Design a protein around this nucleic acid. Structure first.
Ligand SMILES: [Mg+2]
Ligand SMILES: [Zn+2]
Ligand SMILES: [Zn+2]
Lengths: 1144, 69
DNA sequence: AAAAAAAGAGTTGACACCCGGGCGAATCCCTGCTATAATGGGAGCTGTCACGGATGC
DNA sequence: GCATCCGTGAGTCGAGGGTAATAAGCAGGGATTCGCCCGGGTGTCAACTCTTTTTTT
């Protein structure tokens, strides 16, 4: 095992200790015989033998001994795995500077000894000469004589007391002569008692880097490395491809070039070449060294044969082969398959069809184990032969093994957590994976060409864990909001709507039926129609006991689906009186699941699906040409509008005429024909016999809400309005036509323009949604419910949204699911309707909604002040299940997934607006808040800006005479969040951000709970600044746990002096992971260059607490099952310690 | 063949139930299942069905299994 | 009621042979030496923003 | 205190299958490498002597 991963600078001694031998010859392999070389990159003596238990030269190939070493050959006998864990080092004749600590964004070497980055580049390139150790003569230290005349002509002051060096040796000597304690003590005194105008910005960074280099234990001279280690000969393979043509990695080229340049420099130093040639050799060697690491900072190094740039070690870990999505996080998985999906109505809700071909391959080891235990086979090898020939007896074993083993099915674009749902496989013919019609709505994938992957859990614990945690029957409620996701999409809802409709004119009306069997028998004979006014006997059980089966007057279509409803109060035949709209049927599944259990809900959803399909297949839902009708008044409305628009053209300013003639004549005419066709379609025709002939197909499809809409029907039968050009404005030409009649090419060109614009818009906005989802998951990945109760009494006020005289969201729906912070009092009447701290159930919800009440203080995750993590007493009721959230459940990941789910359908607001709001950047130049009170004083005397107005006791929209108070919204739209949090409290900024995000998400018509936004806002604010110099002279931001831990320790050391308090600081979600504690979580999403070089000098040790670290290391995630197992291990360790204490 | 409704009602954690059922199945793999019949069921399903009519506070054995080395 | 031998062990010479280690021989790699006069180099963007930061007077 | 210039980002699963160009010469001496063959340790067999479990007397 291993814990507390630590990363820091590697000294030359450590590099020599890691290496086994030094490479001197750049010879990969021989051309006649393919074997390793003596000192080449691929050496057996340095990187172990190539074969397993077989040394070279055919002397100790017996493989019986592993500790012997071949004398003549020179390599020991060892497995091939040792060739991957052996490294080599390269000796350098001259020192070279690291490319990461030189060309990075913050100049690490320039921060030391106050050296500009422009001057260090001149010394490394051997252009100028730096002077050190100055005497009484001129040319003081750090002179940096540029011209050579100053090095020779100006050097006429004696050959002593004057030292000048050039190249990497100068930087090495400067880093070796620099001191840490003296510089830190000098910077500490200068920081205190200083104006702090511009010198502080560099002094703080210098003090930080010095204190990091001091406590970390890394000397400053390790930056200029002297020896470079080589990767083992297993990550840069040279496997021969088919045909005799080898294929090596691009890493061998860099090492070969470095070795060649080093050998050339060594030969130059021995031959005593001139300084001009030796200098160029050192320059080329240093360039090769600092290009072998990054290859992007300096000039690009491209091979002469291939036209693509070489991939160095830095570029190999950034986006392509790094731990982002290639190897660490996202990797290939076996025991899986892929195939197209189809719809199956006979299958249950928890059963999915699986082809025999895929099941036979995925469950091969299970079939082998069954054949071994059943006794029908003998040797394992023999068994492998039985399934190969596909004997008929193996089919019985496959059906027995696949009985309760759940398989995981997931679509390609896994947006939300519902994309992965386990099922029970059932053998079926064909090659298409069967699926359930109700479960397809959760995956968000049509059956046109989509394909789904299948996985198989091998472990017994993982198999049993997916049955009670990831089964499709358990995922019936959406995690974003409490809305059922098993609502009928297209056909079941249409059938239920067709059955719910009641017509007064029908045969067999007025008769009384006791049982539904009599109704069915009458319908079989044809005496009674499908739906007509009928009084029958039905039981309701409203008093929670037994009912006398009171007679009810409803059509035969009604009370046939109502019989499937479970027996329970608050539900019955009274709820089926509606027209059974899609929204109504969706609301019906919520009440049945809320009142009764989960089994009744799933069984009712299964029963209603078959009835809807059986009823839809019996009626004439066929869409025809006569179903769509155009209003007869449109032919006159369009001609009247054309005649009216003619007079406007002859009158004409052309801009005003063209603008007013198109938004008044065509806009009013477009809405007139729309309502005309709507009234003509909604009208119920009366047949001569006296009964309704039939209902329109498109009208029913639009009213049910399954597929049809208002705009679609309007464009199909109406006038289509006016099209918009790609510039943005609307064309003045009237497109008066519909899809039923012919369309000329001119009016079709504008429609094509609009369609192409929409298609190009929808293709780019979806990538931004994925980027935002990937960015939000990394900032809220550390939020896990660890504690049950926190004991916090604080809370945030919650109010309902209102626009004018109507409310958008009810107060009961917004406050529902959260624990009440304080006891709410009934307005007017002195009665306590809710206790101080109690769970707000549906009964309490509609009780608070019935009696009018103002905002109530409710506990939230943002007001919690518990330990690391989040408690269950502030999150509230879970959204996936009715019961409260359990301990160990990941809240940040589900919140990020729910925030990213409604994306790709948005748009001054929308997706870019949400991305800018979450980042908390500068929206635009807005008036700063006055943050004053009482009398307001003038600002600045026209100094290009108004800094602040003091009252001790640009376009301006507020008068100086009027009084100003703290919190006045003297600002244009889109105010800045930084000054808002600086002046007002954190609760105000949180409420403002929540309101903005909720408005941006509701403008499109997507409901989202404010709990996820509150969790994201809490994850944003985690650092606090420092204003007092007590125990910490720095002013930079720090994690919230350090002052809570440092202030308690500082007060215990000495109460004297002064405390330390500072207001919190806000930062975007992107920078929230920049300064995170664990560098592994930051190196995954952000750039690996700035994260590694910054954490390398400081030497931060990762504790493997976050979820991202455990996934990379391959351990149990600290969430849910992992959290419970860790708690059990902790209690077991405590019990063991208690038992060992008594035993001494 | 059995829902997790009664299982969640017995243990509201919904996470310890998985470990408890896994331990119950590991114990039923050899010399167990004297409380509820198989009824043509596998180990995990039979363990989940037995948990609905068994003592939920049986994690003492699971804790003692990893108590010492 | 008695009493010795084909196997079962145990060797004893009698080949058959199969890579190992030398003796050769045939042949690879390195290195340097050539004497009219040779005297500064060829792509590559340039049809995304936007942010977030690093230099300068 | 601002104006100008250099790093990061861009979803995700699937298909599709291999590649490609320049080109001095010869003389000295060693290290390397492939063929044959004697050979001593490893196998594969004719063929000479104690023991004994009965099967026969
Ligand atoms: Mg599709
Ligand atoms: Zn060897
Ligand atoms: Zn709390």
């Amino acid at each position: 095992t291993f814990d507390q991963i630590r990363i820091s600078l590697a000294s030359p001694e450590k590099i020599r200790s890691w290496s086994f031998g030094e490479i001197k010859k750049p010879e990969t392999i021989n051309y006649r015989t393919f074997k390793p070389e003596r000192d080449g990159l691929f050496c057996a003596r340095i990187f172990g033998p190539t074969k397993d238990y077989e040394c070279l030269c055919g002397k100790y190939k017996r493989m019986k001994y592993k500790g012997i070493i071949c004398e003549k050959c020179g390599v020991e006998v060892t497995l091939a795995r040792v060739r991957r864990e052996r490294m080599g080092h390269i000796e350098l004749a001259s020192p070279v500077a690291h490319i990461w600590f030189l060309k990075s964004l913050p100049s690490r070497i320039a921060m030391m000894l106050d050296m500009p980055l422009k001057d260090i580049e001149r010394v490394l390139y051997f252009e100028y000469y730096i002077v050190t150790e100055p005497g009484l003569t001129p040319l003081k230290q750090h002179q940096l004589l540029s011209e050579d005349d100053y090095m020779r002509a100006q050097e006429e002051y004696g050959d002593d007391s004057f030292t000048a060096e050039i190249g990497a040796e100068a930087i090495q000597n400067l880093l070796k002569a620099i001191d840490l304690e003296k510089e830190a003590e000098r910077l500490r005194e200068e920081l205190s008692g200083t104006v702090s105008d511009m010198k502080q910005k560099k002094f703080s960074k210098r003090l930080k880097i010095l204190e990091a280099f001091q406590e970390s234990g890394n000397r400053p001279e390790w930056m200029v490395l002297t020896v470079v280690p080589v990767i083992p000969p297993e990550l840069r393979p040279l496997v021969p491809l088919d045909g005799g043509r080898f294929a090596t990695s691009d890493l061998n080229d860099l090492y070969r070039r470095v070795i060649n340049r080093n050998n050339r420099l060594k030969r130059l130093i021995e031959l005593r070449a001139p300084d001009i040639i030796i200098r160029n050799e050192k320059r080329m060697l240093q360039e090769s060294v600092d290009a072998l690491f990054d290859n992007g900072r300096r000039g690009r190094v491209i091979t002469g044969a291939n036209k693509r740039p070489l991939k160095s070690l830095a570029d190999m870990l950034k986006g392509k082969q790094g731990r982002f999505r290639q190897n660490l996080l996202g990797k290939r998985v076996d025991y899986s398959g892929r195939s197209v999906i189809v719809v199956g109505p006979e299958l249950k809700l928890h059963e999915c069809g699986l082809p025999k071909k895929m099941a036979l391959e995925l469950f091969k080891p299970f079939i082998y184990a069954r054949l071994d235990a059943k006794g029908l086979s003998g040797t394992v090898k023999q068994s492998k032969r039985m399934v190969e020939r596909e004997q008929p007896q193996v089919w019985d074993i496959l059906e027995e093994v696949i009985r309760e083993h759940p398989v995981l099915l997931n679509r390609a674009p896994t947006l939300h957590r519902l994309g992965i749902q386990a099922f029970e496989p059932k053998l079926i013919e064909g090659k298409a994976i069967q699926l359930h019609p109700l479960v397809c709505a959760a995956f968000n994938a049509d059956f046109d060409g989509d394909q789904m992957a299948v996985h198989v859990p091998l472990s017994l614990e993982a198999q049993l864990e997916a049955r009670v945690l990831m089964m499709s029957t358990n995922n019936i409620l959406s995690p974003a909001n409490g809305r059922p996701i098993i609502v009928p999409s297209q056909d079941i809802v249409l059938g239920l709507y067709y059955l719910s409709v009641a017509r007064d004119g029908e045969p067999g009306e007025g008769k009384i039926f006791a049982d539904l069997g009599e109704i069915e028998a009458a319908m079989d004979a044809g005496v009674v129609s499908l739906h007509a006014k009928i009084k029958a006997r039905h039981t309701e059980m409203t008093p929670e006991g037994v009912l006398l089966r009171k007679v009810i007057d409803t059509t035969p279509g009604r009370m046939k689906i109502a019989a499937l409803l479970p027996h329970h109060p608050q539900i019955g035949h009274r709820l089926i009186e509606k027209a059974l709209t899609k929204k109504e049927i969706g609301n019906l599944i919520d009440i049945v699941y809320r009142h009764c259990g989960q089994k009744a809900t799933v069984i009712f959803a299964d029963k209603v699906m078959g009835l809807g399909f059986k009823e839809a297949a019996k009626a004439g839902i066929s869409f025809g040409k006569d179903d769509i009708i155009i209003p007869v008044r449109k032919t006159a409305i369009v001609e009247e509008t054309r005649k009216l628009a003619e007079e406007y053209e002859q009158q004409y300013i052309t801009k005003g005429e063209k603008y007013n003639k198109v938004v008044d004549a065509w806009a009013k005419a477009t809405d007139r024909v729309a309502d005309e066709m709507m009234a003509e379609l909604q009208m119920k025709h009366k047949d001569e016999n006296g009964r309704e002939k039939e209902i329109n197909a498109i009208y029913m499809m639009a009213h049910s809400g399954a597929r049809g809409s208002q705009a679609q029907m309007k464009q199909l039968g109406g006038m289509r309005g006016l099209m918009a050009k790609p510039s943005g404005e609307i064309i003045e030409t009237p497109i008066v036509s519909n899809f039923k009649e012919g369309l000329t090419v001119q009016e079709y060109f504008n429609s094509t323009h609009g369609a192409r614009k929409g298609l190009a818009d929808t293709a780019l906005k979806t990538a931004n949604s994925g980027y935002l989802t990937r960015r939000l998951v990394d900032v809220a990945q550390d939020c896990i419910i660890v504690e049950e109760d926190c004991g916090t009494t604080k809370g945030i006020t919650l109010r309902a949204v209102v626009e004018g005289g109507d409310v958008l969201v009810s107060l009961g729906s917004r406050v529902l699911g959260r624990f009440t912070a304080e006891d709410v009092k009934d307005p007017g009447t002195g009665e306590l309707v809710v206790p101080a701290d109690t769970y707000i159930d549906e009964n309490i919800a509609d009780a608070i909604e019935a009696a009018v009440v103002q905002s109530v203080k409710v506990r939230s995750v943002l007001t919690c002040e518990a330990k690391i993590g989040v408690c269950g007493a502030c999150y509230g009721r879970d959204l996936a299940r009715g019961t409260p959230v359990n301990i160990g459940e990941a809240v940040g990941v589900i919140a990020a997934q729910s925030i990213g789910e409604p994306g790709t359908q948005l748009t001054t607001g929308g997706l870019p607006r949400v991305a800018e709001l979450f980042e908390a950047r500068r929206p635009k130049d807005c008036a700063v808040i006055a943050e004053m009170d009482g009398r307001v004083e003038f600002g600045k005397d026209y100094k290009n800006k108004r800094r602040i107005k003091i009252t001790p006791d640009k376009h301006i929209a507020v008068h100086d005479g009027d009084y100003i108070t703290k919190g006045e919204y003297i600002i244009d739209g889109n105010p800045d969040p930084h000054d808002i949090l600086r002046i007002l409290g954190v609760e105000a900024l949180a409420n403002f951000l929540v309101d903005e995000i909720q408005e941006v998400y509701r403008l499109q018509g997507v409901p989202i709970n404010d709990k996820h936004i509150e969790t994201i806002v809490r994850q944003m604010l985690q650092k606090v600044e420092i204003l007092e110099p007590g125990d910490t002279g720095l002013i930079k931001g720090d994690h919230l746990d350090k002052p809570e831990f440092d202030k308690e320790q500082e007060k215990a050391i000495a109460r004297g002096g002064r405390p330390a308090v500072t207001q919190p600081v806000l930062l975007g979600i992107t920078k929230a992971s920049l300064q995170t504690k664990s560098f592994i979580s930051a190196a995954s999403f952000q750039e690996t260059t700035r994260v590694l070089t910054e954490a390398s000098v400081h030497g931060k040790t990762d504790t493997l607490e976050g979820l991202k670290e455990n996934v990379i290391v391959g351990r149990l995630i600290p969430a849910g099952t992992g959290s419970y197992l860790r708690s059990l291990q902790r209690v077991a360790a405590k019990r063991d310690e208690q038992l060992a204490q008594q035993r001494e | 063949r059995v829902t997790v409704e009664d299982c969640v009602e017995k243990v509201p954690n919904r996470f310890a139930l998985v470990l408890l059922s896994a331990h119950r199945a590991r114990g039923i793999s050899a010399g167990a299942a004297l409380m509820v019949d198989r009824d043509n069921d596998k180990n995990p399903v039979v363990a989940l069905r037995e948990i609905a009519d068994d003592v939920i506070d049986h994690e003492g054995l699971k804790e003692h299994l990893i108590s010492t080395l």
